[PDB]
Amino acid sequence: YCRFCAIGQLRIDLIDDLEALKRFLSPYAKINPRRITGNCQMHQRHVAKALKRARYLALVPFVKD
Amino acid sequence: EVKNDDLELALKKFKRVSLEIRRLAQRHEYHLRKGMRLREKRKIAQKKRRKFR
Amino acid sequence: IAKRVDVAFITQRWLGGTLTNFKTLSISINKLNKLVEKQAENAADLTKKENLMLSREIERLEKFFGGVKSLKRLPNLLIVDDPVYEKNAVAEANILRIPVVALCNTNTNPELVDFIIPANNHQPQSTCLLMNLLADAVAEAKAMPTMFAYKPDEEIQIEI
Amino acid sequence: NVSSGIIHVSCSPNNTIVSASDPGGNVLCWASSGTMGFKGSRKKTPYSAGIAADKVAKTVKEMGMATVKLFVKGTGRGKDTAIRSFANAGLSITEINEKTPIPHNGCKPPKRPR
Amino acid sequence: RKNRAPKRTVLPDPVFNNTLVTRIINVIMEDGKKGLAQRILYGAFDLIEQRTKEKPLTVFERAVGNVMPRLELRVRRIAGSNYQVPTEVPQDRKIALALRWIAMFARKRHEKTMLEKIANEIIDASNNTGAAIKKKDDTHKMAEANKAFAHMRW
RNA sequence: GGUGCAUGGUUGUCGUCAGCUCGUGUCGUGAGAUGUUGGGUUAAGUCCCGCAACGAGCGCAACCCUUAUCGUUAGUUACA
RNA sequence: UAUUAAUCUAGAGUGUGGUAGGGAGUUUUGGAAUUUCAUGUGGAGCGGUGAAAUGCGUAGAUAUAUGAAGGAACACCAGUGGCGAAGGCGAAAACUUAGGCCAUUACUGACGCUUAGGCUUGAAAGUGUGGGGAGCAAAUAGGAUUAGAUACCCUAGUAGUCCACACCGUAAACGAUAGAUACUAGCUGUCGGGGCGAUCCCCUCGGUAGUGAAGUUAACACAUUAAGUAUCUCGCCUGGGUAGUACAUUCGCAAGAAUGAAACUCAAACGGAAUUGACGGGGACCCGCACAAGUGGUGGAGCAUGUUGCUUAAUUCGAC
């Protein structure tokens, strides 16, 4: 279930589609792999970078809910 | 990793969380290499692509 | 097809070799027919366990020879419902010199059958029509009334 | 003691420790797998951890406690069964947190046991 | 690998009307005879109402009910430090083990004529004084002692 | 008298284990495979479905000896 | 075959529009977590394997919870992966940014490719200098199974591991697959581009992979990225130990490395793959007084039996 090729924005950054980035983020502050997300993986790797930034930005915890 | 559902149901939901943490953090007591880390990442990818698909 | 034109046919397992190897299979089908004839002649001359074993062996031979037991001679021509489904049949036909007619599918290969026909088995509209018309060819060849091959749209035998 | 408090459970491949403590940090009691006649191989089993956890829950119930906080720190296989032992030993549970020394992929660990 | 086989239980002793009676007679078997252990059991009962008086039928059924064990221990080893794992057994082997215990603790003793010693042995095994009840208590207490190794069952 | 480092004849052994195979044929450039393996069943390849397969033999069992119900040939020296 | 001139690009590459990636290096920040430090508590353990042991510990150890210093790398994200000259890259960010991708009609206009020479890099170890040893750990110290054992394991601990100038310029440098050019299905599956639509299920061309047609190979197996198709070029293998030992060239302060022999011997090489078995501290399947149980018997004891080491006038031989 892609959320960036589906939305057609095609623009990935820190804060403009955060809920779309979190759609691939489990409540456990962990991102689902490619075999679970099943998307174009441009947007999924962008999610990877953005949510690792969020962990660095303390949006979501490292090891917590 | 917090789990607060009921007196006992919270632990029932926490069982899977504890299993996940135990399987994730078990690799800090033996020898490992970064190339072997990528190797085992590819191996588990193949495992979940063949079994879990 | 058989009830419209009398002809030897194979419906059970086409054995992995019944045309390139048919000598010890000719003797096998002869043993089967002879044992059935003896059982018709026999009426409980032995213990019933031996009769149970006799029926056991008869059915064992039937479950492999049930298809190939009506012809006593090698065929001069054979049809195929699917080239990949009848690997034994096409193999034994290529060992001989008899041409092959098959209903090729897009997942099959067209370099295996002497008469490639794009007839689907997943879609029954082709296979039913082709079976009926193959029957009708030899029917009109034998000077008997013909059912199909002159209709714009024959019987709709769509499989569920 | 105080009705509140925290029960902490730590596990290493050949050790388990369980301590009932005040919320400020000071402990009220603690036990380990070696406290009984199961030291060694028998102390790597969930039985030793369960009995130690029951012992500390019982001795802190005598010392005075109720529904407790749950702090697990470690990577042991019995880190889930210990919480069940807390729940069934009178020191019931409502929530559980993680104080584990789980390292984000870091430096060299000890040598490989095999 | 053989599996469940048709074990057979013979007709009960038709002078006391109990299958456990004939099983006991055929477990304490000396020289092969049942006319031997039958006399042994009858004289044992006679001396039972002679010393330590008790009705033979009630005391026998009570002993049969009580001296039966609870579980069994299978030996398990992988590399070292072998241990036991609990397992369940049908009651036939339980009463068989009771038979064997009675035979072993009766056929061998000083303290003269066997009549009174076997009567004393069966009476002690009946009134819960330790001759076979201790094994039943231990096998229950054994599971909670080596439970750390008992849990390791596959 | 010996060399079972010639052996025969005879066996034991795995093991009464459920295995050993073979002819028809085909594939693999080749050793090799296939039929037997797997899955069902009395210990049991007693037996069956299946397949590059078809059948057939050896082991095995049903078949043989003893135990064995009734009847049948016939009755003493068993019986009495 | 090669040269001559220019327009055509169509490979060399280039432009416009877009473009994925942990590329690399340098720089910036952060603490989840451990140790020191601070608050404490507490009783008798902690540390850990195959059982345990070395070791820490009543002076307070382990544990218990966070916080400053410290430095390591940054759970999932992590792709039948991307990128990357193989080599290697995973917290996040910035600078240079290499190259990957199409829409590439357009563009100098054969410019091109390999390439011994040469240049560079090639992991990591280790090591010269400046740091921490918080954590790990070679060497080291101890316990432990091997007949010892340095080897499995566990605990600690110096250099070092981690950073920068870096060096050794060596590999299991693996796709065990040298590059560049032109072409070759389908399918399986990860990815990029343009195009047009909700995203997968859309097309095209490519990067990294596989089954597999034709094709190739000794078979295994390559197969659109070939080991194919043909070309071009370079280096190597024309047997193994001999053999990285002889001489000898070169790099290095350091630890050590690149090219490179023989006499002598074997018909072979720890030659390769496939190919039928049993074993496996690899198992699946199928069964047996094969195992438990009691009955016993022997090993414990007496004779009865025959033998064996010994002893005889022979203690007949074999069955081991």
mmCIF file of C-alpha atoms in Angstrom, chain C:
data_model
loop_
_atom_site.group_PDB
_atom_site.id
_atom_site.type_symbol
_atom_site.label_atom_id
_atom_site.label_comp_id
_atom_site.label_asym_id
_atom_site.label_seq_id
_atom_site.Cartn_x
_atom_site.Cartn_y
_atom_site.Cartn_z
ATOM 1 C CA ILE C 1 -16.217 -39.693 -29.087
ATOM 2 C CA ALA C 2 -16.226 -43.435 -28.392
ATOM 3 C CA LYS C 3 -20.032 -43.628 -28.231
ATOM 4 C CA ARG C 4 -20.227 -41.761 -31.550
ATOM 5 C CA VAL C 5 -17.476 -43.727 -33.345
ATOM 6 C CA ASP C 6 -16.092 -47.028 -32.070
ATOM 7 C CA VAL C 7 -12.362 -46.542 -31.521
ATOM 8 C CA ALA C 8 -9.696 -47.584 -29.040
ATOM 9 C CA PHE C 9 -9.011 -44.860 -26.489
ATOM 10 C CA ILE C 10 -6.948 -44.188 -23.363
ATOM 11 C CA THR C 11 -8.532 -42.464 -20.357
ATOM 12 C CA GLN C 12 -6.525 -43.705 -17.351
ATOM 13 C CA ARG C 13 -2.770 -43.089 -16.854
ATOM 14 C CA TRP C 14 -0.949 -43.151 -20.185
ATOM 15 C CA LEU C 15 1.999 -45.189 -18.962
ATOM 16 C CA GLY C 16 5.522 -43.861 -19.335
ATOM 17 C CA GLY C 17 6.149 -46.018 -22.372
ATOM 18 C CA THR C 18 3.413 -48.120 -23.932
ATOM 19 C CA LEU C 19 4.295 -47.741 -27.632
ATOM 20 C CA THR C 20 8.098 -47.876 -27.628
ATOM 21 C CA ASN C 21 7.747 -50.674 -25.039
ATOM 22 C CA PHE C 22 4.598 -52.730 -25.638
ATOM 23 C CA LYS C 23 5.875 -56.328 -25.895
ATOM 24 C CA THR C 24 5.897 -56.990 -22.141
ATOM 25 C CA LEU C 25 2.780 -54.817 -22.026
ATOM 26 C CA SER C 26 1.125 -56.920 -24.727
ATOM 27 C CA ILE C 27 1.867 -59.973 -22.592
ATOM 28 C CA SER C 28 0.589 -58.033 -19.566
ATOM 29 C CA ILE C 29 -2.766 -57.186 -21.173
ATOM 30 C CA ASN C 30 -2.972 -60.771 -22.450
ATOM 31 C CA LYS C 31 -2.411 -62.031 -18.894
ATOM 32 C CA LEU C 32 -5.160 -59.669 -17.736
ATOM 33 C CA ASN C 33 -7.668 -60.901 -20.330
ATOM 34 C CA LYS C 34 -6.746 -64.545 -19.704
ATOM 35 C CA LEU C 35 -7.164 -64.119 -15.941
ATOM 36 C CA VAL C 36 -10.577 -62.486 -16.429
ATOM 37 C CA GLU C 37 -11.574 -65.356 -18.733
ATOM 38 C CA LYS C 38 -10.416 -67.891 -16.136
ATOM 39 C CA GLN C 39 -12.342 -66.071 -13.394
ATOM 40 C CA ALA C 40 -15.431 -66.240 -15.607
ATOM 41 C CA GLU C 41 -14.769 -69.973 -15.981
ATOM 42 C CA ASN C 42 -13.786 -70.381 -12.316
ATOM 43 C CA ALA C 43 -16.372 -70.586 -9.538
ATOM 44 C CA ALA C 44 -14.790 -70.684 -6.059
ATOM 45 C CA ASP C 45 -12.320 -73.546 -6.478
ATOM 46 C CA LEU C 46 -9.930 -72.204 -3.811
ATOM 47 C CA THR C 47 -9.876 -70.367 -0.489
ATOM 48 C CA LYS C 48 -11.485 -66.942 -0.523
ATOM 49 C CA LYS C 49 -8.284 -65.119 0.458
ATOM 50 C CA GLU C 50 -6.727 -66.245 -2.829
ATOM 51 C CA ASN C 51 -9.822 -64.963 -4.649
ATOM 52 C CA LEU C 52 -9.434 -61.647 -2.814
ATOM 53 C CA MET C 53 -5.821 -61.517 -3.998
ATOM 54 C CA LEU C 54 -6.990 -62.365 -7.529
ATOM 55 C CA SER C 55 -9.393 -59.411 -7.534
ATOM 56 C CA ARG C 56 -6.637 -57.329 -5.909
ATOM 57 C CA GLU C 57 -4.252 -58.053 -8.779
ATOM 58 C CA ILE C 58 -6.977 -57.498 -11.391
ATOM 59 C CA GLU C 59 -7.708 -54.036 -10.004
ATOM 60 C CA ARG C 60 -3.979 -53.303 -9.662
ATOM 61 C CA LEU C 61 -3.543 -54.029 -13.366
ATOM 62 C CA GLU C 62 -6.687 -52.028 -14.179
ATOM 63 C CA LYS C 63 -5.568 -48.852 -12.417
ATOM 64 C CA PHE C 64 -2.509 -48.624 -14.750
ATOM 65 C CA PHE C 65 -3.836 -50.357 -17.888
ATOM 66 C CA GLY C 66 -7.377 -48.957 -17.669
ATOM 67 C CA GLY C 67 -6.590 -46.476 -20.416
ATOM 68 C CA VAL C 68 -4.271 -48.588 -22.563
ATOM 69 C CA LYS C 69 -6.070 -51.916 -22.813
ATOM 70 C CA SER C 70 -8.380 -51.505 -25.835
ATOM 71 C CA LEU C 71 -5.711 -51.453 -28.569
ATOM 72 C CA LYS C 72 -3.681 -54.565 -29.383
ATOM 73 C CA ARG C 73 -1.613 -52.731 -32.033
ATOM 74 C CA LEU C 74 0.476 -49.565 -32.065
ATOM 75 C CA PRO C 75 -1.541 -46.533 -33.226
ATOM 76 C CA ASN C 76 -0.968 -44.947 -36.619
ATOM 77 C CA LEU C 77 -2.140 -41.537 -35.318
ATOM 78 C CA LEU C 78 -2.960 -40.000 -31.924
ATOM 79 C CA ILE C 79 -4.546 -36.839 -30.557
ATOM 80 C CA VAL C 80 -3.491 -34.900 -27.455
ATOM 81 C CA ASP C 81 -5.553 -32.674 -25.162
ATOM 82 C CA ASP C 82 -2.475 -30.764 -23.919
ATOM 83 C CA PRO C 83 1.178 -31.196 -24.993
ATOM 84 C CA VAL C 84 2.479 -30.796 -21.433
ATOM 85 C CA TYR C 85 -0.274 -32.965 -19.910
ATOM 86 C CA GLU C 86 0.564 -35.901 -22.201
ATOM 87 C CA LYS C 87 4.372 -35.956 -22.040
ATOM 88 C CA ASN C 88 4.420 -39.767 -22.156
ATOM 89 C CA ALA C 89 2.090 -39.868 -25.170
ATOM 90 C CA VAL C 90 4.077 -37.353 -27.219
ATOM 91 C CA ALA C 91 7.362 -38.995 -26.204
ATOM 92 C CA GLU C 92 6.205 -42.434 -27.365
ATOM 93 C CA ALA C 93 4.774 -40.895 -30.543
ATOM 94 C CA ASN C 94 8.102 -39.195 -31.321
ATOM 95 C CA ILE C 95 9.894 -42.497 -30.736
ATOM 96 C CA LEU C 96 7.629 -43.843 -33.486
ATOM 97 C CA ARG C 97 6.931 -41.951 -36.727
ATOM 98 C CA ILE C 98 3.244 -41.160 -36.078
ATOM 99 C CA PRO C 99 2.341 -37.448 -36.238
ATOM 100 C CA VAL C 100 1.008 -35.719 -33.132
ATOM 101 C CA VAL C 101 -2.091 -33.536 -32.814
ATOM 102 C CA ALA C 102 -2.332 -31.505 -29.615
ATOM 103 C CA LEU C 103 -4.175 -28.546 -28.111
ATOM 104 C CA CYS C 104 -1.217 -26.282 -27.433
ATOM 105 C CA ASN C 105 -1.397 -23.716 -24.641
ATOM 106 C CA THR C 106 0.604 -20.515 -24.307
ATOM 107 C CA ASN C 107 2.596 -22.009 -21.417
ATOM 108 C CA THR C 108 3.550 -25.012 -23.585
ATOM 109 C CA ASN C 109 6.087 -25.147 -26.436
ATOM 110 C CA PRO C 110 5.146 -25.313 -30.132
ATOM 111 C CA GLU C 111 8.300 -27.184 -31.185
ATOM 112 C CA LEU C 112 6.985 -30.541 -29.912
ATOM 113 C CA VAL C 113 3.756 -31.332 -31.810
ATOM 114 C CA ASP C 114 3.477 -32.222 -35.499
ATOM 115 C CA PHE C 115 0.139 -30.337 -35.658
ATOM 116 C CA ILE C 116 0.102 -27.235 -33.462
ATOM 117 C CA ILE C 117 -3.426 -25.986 -32.764
ATOM 118 C CA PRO C 118 -4.063 -23.024 -30.412
ATOM 119 C CA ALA C 119 -6.865 -24.724 -28.460
ATOM 120 C CA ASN C 120 -7.261 -23.874 -24.778
ATOM 121 C CA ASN C 121 -8.109 -26.447 -22.124
ATOM 122 C CA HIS C 122 -8.680 -23.771 -19.475
ATOM 123 C CA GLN C 123 -11.274 -22.326 -21.853
ATOM 124 C CA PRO C 124 -13.478 -25.295 -22.834
ATOM 125 C CA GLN C 125 -15.009 -23.630 -25.917
ATOM 126 C CA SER C 126 -11.992 -24.696 -27.995
ATOM 127 C CA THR C 127 -11.268 -28.177 -26.633
ATOM 128 C CA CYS C 128 -14.868 -29.427 -26.763
ATOM 129 C CA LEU C 129 -15.268 -28.192 -30.351
ATOM 130 C CA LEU C 130 -11.994 -29.787 -31.422
ATOM 131 C CA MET C 131 -12.838 -33.147 -29.826
ATOM 132 C CA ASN C 132 -16.248 -33.191 -31.518
ATOM 133 C CA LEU C 133 -14.783 -32.266 -34.911
ATOM 134 C CA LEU C 134 -11.991 -34.840 -34.615
ATOM 135 C CA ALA C 135 -14.685 -37.448 -33.963
ATOM 136 C CA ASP C 136 -16.733 -36.127 -36.885
ATOM 137 C CA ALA C 137 -13.801 -36.357 -39.302
ATOM 138 C CA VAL C 138 -13.476 -40.119 -38.855
ATOM 139 C CA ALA C 139 -17.274 -40.410 -38.630
ATOM 140 C CA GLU C 140 -17.754 -38.953 -42.110
ATOM 141 C CA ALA C 141 -14.723 -40.983 -43.186
ATOM 142 C CA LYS C 142 -16.648 -44.118 -42.145
ATOM 143 C CA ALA C 143 -19.861 -43.053 -43.960
ATOM 144 C CA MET C 144 -22.107 -42.409 -40.952
ATOM 145 C CA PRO C 145 -24.180 -39.362 -39.951
ATOM 146 C CA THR C 146 -22.077 -36.428 -38.746
ATOM 147 C CA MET C 147 -22.942 -34.305 -35.711
ATOM 148 C CA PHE C 148 -20.799 -31.163 -36.042
ATOM 149 C CA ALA C 149 -18.192 -29.328 -38.217
ATOM 150 C CA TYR C 150 -20.927 -27.636 -40.280
ATOM 151 C CA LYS C 151 -22.588 -25.491 -37.538
ATOM 152 C CA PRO C 152 -21.709 -21.804 -37.089
ATOM 153 C CA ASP C 153 -21.843 -22.326 -33.306
ATOM 154 C CA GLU C 154 -21.892 -25.867 -31.924
ATOM 155 C CA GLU C 155 -22.900 -27.079 -28.450
ATOM 156 C CA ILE C 156 -21.832 -24.719 -25.648
ATOM 157 C CA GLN C 157 -19.987 -27.177 -23.388
ATOM 158 C CA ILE C 158 -18.580 -24.631 -20.946
ATOM 159 C CA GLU C 159 -16.944 -26.264 -17.928
ATOM 160 C CA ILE C 160 -17.577 -24.665 -14.539
#
